[PDB]
Design a protein around this ligand. Structure first.
Ligand SMILES: [Zn+2]
Ligand SMILES: [Zn+2]
Lengths: 135, 81, 61, 232, 104
RNA sequence: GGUGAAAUUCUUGGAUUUAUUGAAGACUAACAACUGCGAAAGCAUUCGCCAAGGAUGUUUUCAUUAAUCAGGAACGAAAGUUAGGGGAUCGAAGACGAUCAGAUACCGUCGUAGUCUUAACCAUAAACUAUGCCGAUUAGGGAUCGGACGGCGUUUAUUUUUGA
């Protein structure tokens, strides 16, 4: 069911939070990125689809991750926040910080926060035109 | 100002103006005699020489050209003649 | 539900579009170290006592 | 949202029967090469070995991101992360060796500042062991304690002199080394401190670092070499 | 009439400069004309630092910062109240505003 | 997914998300500024080759060889045109979804010419400092880029002279 280990030691995971301006993703994998352990999005919790990015929805989605990952044996997480990136805003969305607290309050351990948003050295042309969205 | 003697500027004031903007133009370069340690000869060298100067005896370099006034070899002495 | 009790120590201006809402800083009166920011609808004085159903929402500014 | 699905399962489908795929997983330990201090770095998960699907084939091309602070038990090296690639699988154990190096994102953004000059260069090199790997370098101008002038800028002619000096030093140091030998030089930052002394005459040039290293080619597997560093 | 001596551009001594993309409406403007703001902030807001601090496994911990450089066209600059209209005499004053260092 | 709010569209024929690897074309972030070069248009990753240019320095050389120019000639952003190569991204025309009394638009999902390059045409821009070119004189100040000269110190190297 879970990894056999002495009571003193604790096993580590990594959480990859993708927070855009339209939705928020909570994703837990093993130490490497190959195997997914749990994943729940903000749209599963809210029923009005204009609140998928709301900070309230991120808290609910983050809480049951700790419950679902508790019996697997994993007890600590690494965190990697990322924005849309590329040609996007590069500013993490409103739900980026709400989800991080709910893992800490639920009782899980935290270490090595980092930001992994991908940035281009020189990008292709960006959507919109030369005059932008005129509304 | 408004009352100045233009005919007789102080010598200190003429040491700061451009070489061409004084009352009468005058060069600020000179010739010099260089004492090579190796030999006993005397050579006349321009202060702003653009070419590498070779002494007549023992064939030793005495100066290296540069942007302004040529720099002498470290082990050499000169007098302004 | 593990309901918590909080007490008001200072009031920090009046918010809202029409001044109905007021913003106060509360104290959990069981762990004196912790302190958060909350929002209240009615009139509030210092040393007032409030009952909080959930203690993880906080408020803007 | 529950009430948005229209096509659902698709053109035509039926529900599933068996669930909870986590009942057939297994856990393995991960080890570390010789130069690093601590060897245990965590746990890994995989499907149980079965017919037509051996477990060892899935644990031969995985890489892990481990912060250098954990390996050396020192918080000074808190901005460098390196990768370890699994090669051989003993009984409930995975063996790994060096696979690269890279700075953290936040440390690099704090270094670059206005009214300074940024100098960067790169060069490929191969070791006595036929490893083809590439190195990056970075440096910045240094202010003087009694300086009054606002900006410290170097002339582009001086920049090329420094850039030429960087390439010469890197080739000389990595000319006669092995991959194990080279890694032992990266963690004490020997390259950076040696570069600073040589370029002292051209310009002060504070904050010399090796930004990242990645390898391009590998020789035959040579299982004998892997066991030499492991199991000490 | 000229409203500004520098034409509101800051470009003298050259003929052309490559444009950039606005961070809000994705418009194209010359780089020297855009309004640029550099911001340094923490990963988490000050109320949430305590919850992260006592949940760590590294004794004392310091949350990292985040560094951004936003840059806008003038149309998006004064609608978001980044800058605002000044008086005729007050226009010619380019000193940065004195940030409050006491905060009452 | 996307929006002020929605829809068109994709999805257990596994969408979205996660790690490793490959191919193709375009572009050179941060450093980057009341800073540099060019007759103007313009020009920003590294290194090799080729010819050209400004300023400074000079007790070199020629001795009026000069200024501006009707007609005349070279270069001249973007779009557009003629033949091949290339065709990732954006996107005139076109097709749909909403809004609206109407919406051939502003907003959203697709998408052809074009966007890139070689060999030839075109010769127009708010091509703007809305300010033609050469020469003389007229007031105070502190910043800055390139070269030379003078000076008290600090720093530093196979170290001095040089560089900061
Ligand atoms: Zn002699
Ligand atoms: Zn804008």
């Amino acid at each position: 069911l879970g990894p056999q280990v002495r009571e003193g030691e604790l096993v580590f995971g990594v959480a990859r939070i993708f927070a855009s301006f339209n939705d928020t993703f909570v994703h837990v994998t093993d130490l490497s990125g190959r195997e997914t352990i749990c994943r729940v999005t903000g749209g599963m919790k809210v029923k009005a689809d204009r609140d998928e990015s709301s900070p309230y929805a991120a808290m609910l989605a983050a809480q049951d991750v700790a419950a679902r990952c508790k019996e697997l044996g994993i007890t600590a997480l690494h965190i990697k926040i990322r924005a849309t990136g590329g040609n996007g805003t590069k500013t993490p969305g409103p739900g980026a910080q709400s989800a991080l607290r709910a893992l800490a309050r639920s009782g899980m351990k935290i270490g090595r926060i980092e930001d992994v948003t991908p940035t281009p050295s020189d990008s292709t042309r960006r959507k919109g035109g030369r005059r932008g969205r005129r509304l | 100002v408004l009352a100045v003697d233009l005919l007789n500027p102080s010598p200190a004031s003429e040491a700061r103006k451009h070489k061409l903007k004084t009352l009468v133009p005058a060069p600020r370069s000179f010739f010099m005699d260089v004492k090579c340690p190796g030999c006993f000869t005397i050579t006349t060298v321009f202060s702003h020489a653009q070419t590498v100067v070779i002494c007549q005896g023992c064939t030793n370099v005495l100066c290296q050209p540069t942007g302004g006034k040529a720099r002498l070899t470290e082990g050499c002495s000169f007098r302004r003649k | 539900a593990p309901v918590k009790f909080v007490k008001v120590t200072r009031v920090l201006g009046r918010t809202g579009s029409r001044g109905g809402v007021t913003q106060v800083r509360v104290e959990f009166m069981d762990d004196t170290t912790r302190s958060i920011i909350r929002n209240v609808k009615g009139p509030v004085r210092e040393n007032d006592i409030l009952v909080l159903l959930e203690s993880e929402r906080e408020a803007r500014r | 949202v529950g009430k948005n699905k229209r096509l659902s399962k698709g053109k035509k489908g039926l529900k599933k029967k068996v669930q909870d795929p986590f009942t057939r997983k297994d856990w393995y330990n991960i080890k570390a090469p010789a130069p690093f201090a601590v060897r245990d770095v965590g746990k890994t998960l995989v499907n149980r070995t079965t017919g037509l699907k051996n477990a060892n084939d899935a644990l031969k091309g995985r890489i892990f991101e481990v912060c250098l602070a954990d390996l050396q038990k020192d918080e000074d090296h808190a901005f460098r992360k390196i990768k370890l690639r699994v090669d051989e699988v003993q009984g409930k154990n995975c063996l790994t060796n060096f696979h690269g190096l890279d700075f953290t994102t936040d440390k690099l953004r704090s270094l670059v500042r206005k009214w300074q000059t940024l100098i960067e260069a790169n060069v490929t090199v191969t070791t006595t062991d036929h490893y083809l790997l590439r190195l990056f370098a970075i440096a910045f101008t240094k202010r003087r304690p009694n300086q009054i002038k606002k900006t410290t800028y170097a002339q582009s002619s001086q920049i090329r002199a420094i850039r030429r000096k960087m390439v010469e030093i890197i080739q000389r140091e990595a000319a006669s080394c092995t991959l194990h030998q080279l890694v032992s030089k990266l963690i004490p930052e020997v390259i950076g401190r040696e570069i600073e002394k040589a370029t002292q005459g051209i310009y002060p040039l504070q904050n010399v670092h090796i930004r990242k290293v990645k390898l391009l080619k590998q020789p035959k597997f040579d299982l004998g070499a892997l066991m030499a560093l492991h199991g000490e | 009439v000229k409203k500004r001596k520098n034409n509101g551009r800051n470009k003298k001594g050259r003929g052309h400069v490559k444009p950039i993309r606005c961070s809000n409406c994705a418009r194209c403007t010359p780089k020297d004309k855009a309004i640029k703001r550099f911001t340094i902030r923490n990963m988490v807001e000050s109320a949430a630092i305590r919850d992260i601090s006592d949940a760590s496994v590294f004794a004392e911990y310091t949350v990292p910062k985040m560094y951004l450089k936003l840059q806008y066209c003038v149309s998006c600059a004064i609608h978001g109240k980044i800058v605002r209209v000044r008086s005729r005499e007050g226009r010619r004053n380019r000193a940065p505003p004195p940030r409050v260092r006491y905060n009452k």
